[PDB]
Amino acid sequence: PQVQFKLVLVGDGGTGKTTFVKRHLTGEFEKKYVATLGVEVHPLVFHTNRGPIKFNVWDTAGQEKFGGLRDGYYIQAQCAIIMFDVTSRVTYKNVPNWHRDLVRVCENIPIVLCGNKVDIKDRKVKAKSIVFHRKKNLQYYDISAKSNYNFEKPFLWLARKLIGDPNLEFVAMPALAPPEVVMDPALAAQYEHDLEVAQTTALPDEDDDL
Amino acid sequence: FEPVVPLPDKIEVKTGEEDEEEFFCNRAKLFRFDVESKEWKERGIGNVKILRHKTSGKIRLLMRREQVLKICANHYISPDMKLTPNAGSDRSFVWHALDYADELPKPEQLAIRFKTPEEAALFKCKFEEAQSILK
Numbered sequence: 001p002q003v004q005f006k007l008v009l010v011g012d013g014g015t016g017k018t019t020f021v022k023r024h025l026t027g028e029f030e031k032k033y034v035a036t037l038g039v040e041v042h043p044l045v046f047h048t049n050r051g052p053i054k055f056n057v058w059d060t061a062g063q064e065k066f067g068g069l070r071d072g073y074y075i076q077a078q079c080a081i082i083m084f085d086v087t088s089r090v091t092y093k094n095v096p097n098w099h100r101d102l103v104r105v106c107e108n109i110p111i112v113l114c115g116n117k118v119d120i121k122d123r124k125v126k127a128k129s130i131v132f133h134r135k136k137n138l139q140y141y142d143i144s145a146k147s148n149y150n151f152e153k154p155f156l157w158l159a160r161k162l163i164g165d166p167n168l169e170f171v172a173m174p175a176l177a178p179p180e181v182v183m184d185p186a187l188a189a190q191y192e193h194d195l196e197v198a199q200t201t202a203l204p205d206e207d208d209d210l
Numbered sequence: 211f212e213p214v215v216p217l218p219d220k221i222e223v224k225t226g227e228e229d230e231e232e233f234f235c236n237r238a239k240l241f242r243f244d245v246e247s248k249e250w251k252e253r254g255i256g257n258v259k260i261l262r263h264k265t266s267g268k269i270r271l272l273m274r275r276e277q278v279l280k281i282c283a284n285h286y287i288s289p290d291m292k293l294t295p296n297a298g299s300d301r302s303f304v305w306h307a308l309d310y311a312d313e314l315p316k317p318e319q320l321a322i323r324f325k326t327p328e329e330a331a332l333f334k335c336k337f338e339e340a341q342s343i344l345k
């Protein structure tokens with residue numbers, strides 16, 4: 001047994017839902033726009049002072065062509081994230097539509113509203129304009145899947161509501177002992193080849209993140 | 211909102227490093243090579259550490275992402291590893307390891323970068339000092 005929660009991630013296309021999920025999953029930042037086809041379910045595990053918790057994130061597609069499948073996606077949903085893009089007013093304009101269709105199927109589930117891409121200077125949806133969370137008593141967060149600004153707070157807020165512990169803490173992941181090294185000769189060549197290609201390929205541009 | 215699952219008990223929170231001493235600790239950015247896409251992918255930013263167990267003497271490299279505090283590198287340092295500069299850089303290294311960051315043994319080509327060449331040089335120094343007293 002383990003503590004699992006189904007989370008449905010919804011929002012207009014291009015708001016960064018998948019990039020947000022992959023940043024948590026592997027730490028990567030995908031710059032390319034590879035639209036999701038239907039839905040992809042990704043497990044995200046967080047470590048708390050009450051043990052590990054797993055969010056089975058249903059990363060749904062924002063394209064309208066999948067609108068007829070969303071009620072099936074939202075089946076057995078225990079929590080949700082509604083995503084919009086602070087550089088695209090239309091994505092915020094649609095937030096009420098995502099919320100309406102969610103609560104028709106789910107009714108009383110914890111829901112977090114996220115305004116993504118706050119790392120971009122030319123912000124179009126100002127904090128003053130964001131009023132829908134006050135309208136539907138939702139939790140809101142400015143986030144950035146690129147700079148990681150607040151990108152963990154949605155899961156922390158939802159985990160507290162789902163667990164019933166308002167003071168649940170995300171703690172350092174226990175560093176278990178890694179496997180021993182056999183240093184076998186046969187498999188070495190394959191890794192040596194993979195390592196030369198990696199050494200030749202240049203690393204990403206130096207950022208001010210460091 | 212009412213809870214959905216029973217309230218799991220509090221656990222004794224441990225980092226997993228209590229029985230180890232730090233030979234090195236410094237902020238860095240980690241990368242992992244995706245041979246399918248043939249591109250480096252950001253793996254995590256935070257403190258990379260070299261840890262020696264106080265009784266067994268085994269030494270490992272451990273790195274945590276900021277904010278999430280999740281593990282992005284965890285592998286024992288072996289004498290076969292060799293820190294190799296990436297593209298004539300004086301601030302970054304590449305090497306191969308059987309990593310356990312996801313708690314599954316994965317062979318990975320990793321790259322680590324530091325803000326300054328001095329930080330990178332100290333890392334190489336301690337990484338290779340560990341390789342000389344491996345137990």
Ligand SMILES: Nc1nc2c(ncn2[C@@H]2O[C@H](COP(=O)(O)OP(=O)(O)NP(=O)(O)O)[C@@H](O)[C@H]2O)c(=O)[nH]1
Pocket residue numbers: 011012013014015016017018019020030031032033034035036037060061062063116117118119120143144145146147
């Ligand atoms: N600057 C910036 N770009 C971001 C951010 N998050 C995502 N992006 C970019 O936005 C684009 C679309 O992201 P993606 O995750 O595919 O969007 P989506 O919401 O999953 N789209 P869909 O519903 O069609 O699957 C990508 O080029 C990605 O790099 C962010 O926080 N900042």
Ligand SMILES: [Mg+2]
Pocket residue numbers: 017018019034035036059060061
């Ligand atoms: Mg997507």
